[PDB]
Amino acid sequence: MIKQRTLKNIIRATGVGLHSGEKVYLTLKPAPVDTGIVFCRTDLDPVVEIPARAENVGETTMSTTLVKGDVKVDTVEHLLSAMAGLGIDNAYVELSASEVPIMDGSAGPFVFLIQSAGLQEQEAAKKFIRIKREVSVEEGDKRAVFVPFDGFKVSFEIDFDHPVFRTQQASVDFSSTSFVKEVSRARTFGFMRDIEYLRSQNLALGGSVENAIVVDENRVLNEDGLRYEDEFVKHKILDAIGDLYLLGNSLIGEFRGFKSGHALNNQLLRTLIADKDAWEVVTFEDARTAPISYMRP
Ligand SMILES: CC#CCOc1ccc(C(=O)N[C@H](C(=O)NO)C(C)(C)N)cc1
Numbered sequence: 001m002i003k004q005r006t007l008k009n010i011i012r013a014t015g016v017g018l019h020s021g022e023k024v025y026l027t028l029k030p031a032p033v034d035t036g037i038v039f040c041r042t043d044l045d046p047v048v049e050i051p052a053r054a055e056n057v058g059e060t061t062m063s064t065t066l067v068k069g070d071v072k073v074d075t076v077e078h079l080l081s082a083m084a085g086l087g088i089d090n091a092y093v094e095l096s097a098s099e100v101p102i103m104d105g106s107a108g109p110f111v112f113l114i115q116s117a118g119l120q121e122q123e124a125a126k127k128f129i130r131i132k133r134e135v136s137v138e139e140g141d142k143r144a145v146f147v148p149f150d151g152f153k154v155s156f157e158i159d160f161d162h163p164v165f166r167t168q169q170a171s172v173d174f175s176s177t178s179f180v181k182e183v184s185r186a187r188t189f190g191f192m193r194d195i196e197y198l199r200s201q202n203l204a205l206g207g208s209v210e211n212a213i214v215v216d217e218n219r220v221l222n223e224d225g226l227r228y229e230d231e232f233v234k235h236k237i238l239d240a241i242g243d244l245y246l247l248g249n250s251l252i253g254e255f256r257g258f259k260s261g262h263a264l265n266n267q268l269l270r271t272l273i274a275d276k277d278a279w280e281v282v283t284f285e286d287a288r289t290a291p292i293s294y295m296r297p
């Protein structure tokens, strides 16, 4: 069988929230079978747990935020993209603040911290969600779609009227290309002109060339340039993988994004969940037959 996975050992990371600018401690802890991903705010008294599920998504303005009453966990998408890429089903995510650390702006440091500690396969089948029919959400010129596909594929299109914006479309098939090599290192991006407005709203407070691609009026400000020729659209793919992982199970299908973001990604998940005839929970007794393959633990 394709087994569920958790962490072999507890791992720790320190960083700052991209939007809050606040120092934060992140701890990833091994979790038992069928736990899912659960956030734990250890700076609160009492401590608050927020399961990483589509129903707990409260805000989608700049990042995906989880909410439980008056308690929040901001910018969960890059850590969840790393967990989805590596096939982590169960984990406790302890945070000392309301925002996950931005690290270098990509999923790269999270992928490394997890792979350093290593993965533990658990004696229970991994549950997948197969897309049986097309599900789509549109709002204005923005669109987010699930199409049946025997594997996992992400297609994305962005349309920025800026001189820096190169390849604005990309399609990644996870049967042909690894998450680690092709997507994990794609950093988040911001426009210098927006950062001014964002900081007046207490947003992007921790943003810098150290954790983001910073775009000027005509070029990338970062001394060392880009990690990929199409790093902007590859980061949008990284975000969709993370937002989609809030479904709580790995998807077997194709995601297509057209100028979409966190808000529409969550709306698509909400529509899929509601449209129960569009999907089915499946397990694979033989990994040789399975449409999605994961790296050895
Ligand atoms: C100096 C300096 C600086 C950096 O400042 C910012 C400001 C905002 C963002 C942001 O909103 N990013 C989003 C993201 O990746 N959500 O996961 C994205 C790409 C979907 N809009 C990123 C960096």
Ligand SMILES: [Zn+2]
Pocket (backbone or CB within 6 Å): 077, 078, 188, 235, 239
């Ligand atoms: Zn992002």
